[PDB]
C-alpha cells in the first residue's frame with residue numbers, strides 16, 4: 001500500500017501518490033485535480049468538496065470554509081477575532097478554543113476546526129482510495145512554514161481523525177522544492193525562493209538546501225492576499241457594469257454576488273491562457289441575464305496594485321535572508337494565481353529575466369512534493 005501526500009489548502013486541497021515510478025495527482029469524482037476545502041451541513045446531508053462549494057450561494061450560514069485560519073488557534077487569538085467578522089457562519093468559544101456552529105439535520109451542532117479539516121482530509125483520502133483501489137492508511141500532510149506547534153498538532157489531529165497515520169507534517173515550500181527534485185542536491189548550500197500565491201494567502205519563503213537538509217531562511221507575505229482578491233476586483237467591476245446597463249444595484253443580494261463571484265473565478269482562470277473571456281450568467285438578478293466579456297489587459301488594470309504588491313514581500317524576504325537577487329539559485333511558482341501571465345512577468349522582471357520553475361501545475365506542486373516525500377518515508 002502506497003502512502004499519499006495531501007496539500008490541505010486554505011481554499012482548495014490536492015492529493016498525490018507516488019507509484020509505478022512517478023507522481024499521480026489524483027482527480028476527484030468530478031474529474032477535478034483539486035477539491036474545495038469546504039464542508040456544508042443541510043437539513044438532510046453533510047456535503048464535502050465540490051458538492052459543498054457548489055451550494056455555498058444557497059446555504060451561506062451552514063457552509064464552512066477557511067478552517068485552516070482557525071486550526072490550532074485559541075479563541076482570543078487576534079487572528080480569530082479579526083477573521084470571524086467576515087465569515088457568514090458562527091464561531092463560538094468553548095474553553096478558549098474556537099468551534100464552528102451550524103444547523104445540521106435540524107439541530108444546532110458545533111465542530112472544532114480539526115474536525116472540519118478532518119472531513120476535507122477524509123474526502124482527499126477517499127479520492128485516493130477510489131483511484132488506487134485499496135485503503136490508504138499513511139500520509140504526509142503539508143502546512144505553511146509559519147505554523148506553530150499548536151497549528152501543526154491540530155493538523156496532525158485532523159489527519160488522525162480521518163483515519164490516517166501521519167508519517168510527517170512538512171512545510172509547503174519544502175514540499176514544492178521536493179516536487180522539483182531540489183532536495184537531491186549534494187554538499188553546498190543552494191538558495192531557493194518559493195513564490196506561493198494561493199486562493200486566499202501569499203507566502204514567500206527562502207530556503208537553503210545543503211545535501212538534502214532544508215533550512216527556512218526567511219518568510220514573508222500577506223495572509224489576506226490571494227486569487228480570490230483578484231476575483232473580487234472582477235466582481236466589483238461587473239456590479240458596476242450591471243448598474244450602468246440595467247440601473248439596478250445587485251451588491252446587497254448575497255446570492256447574486258456569490259454567483260457573479262463564482263463566474264469571475266472561471267473568467268480569471270480563462271484569462272491565464274486566453275486574451276479575453278466571455279462571462280454569461282442566467283438569471284443573475286430579478287431574472288435578468290448578464291452576458292458580457294473582459295479582456296486580459298482590462299483584468300490586469302483592475303488588479304495592477306495587487307499584482308505589484310507581490311514584489312515587496314520578495315524584497316523583504318531577500319533582506320531578511322541577507323541575500324541579493326543574484327544569489328537565488330531557483331525560483332519556484334506555487335498557487336493557481338502564479339499562472340497569471342502578468343504575475344509571472346512581474347516576478348521574472350524583478351529577477352532580471354531568470355527562469356521560473358513552472359512546469360508542475362502550481363496548484364498541484366505542494367501535493368506532488370508531499371507524495372514524493374511520503375514514498376521516501378515508506379522506503
Ligand SMILES: [Cl-]
Pocket residue numbers: 028029030049050127
Ligand atoms: Cl469527489
Ligand SMILES: [Mg+2]
Pocket residue numbers: 009010172196198335366
Ligand atoms: Mg497552497
Ligand SMILES: [Mg+2]
Pocket residue numbers: 009010011198199200201202226
Ligand atoms: Mg491560499
Ligand code: NA
Pocket residue numbers: 010144201202203
Ligand atoms: Na498560507
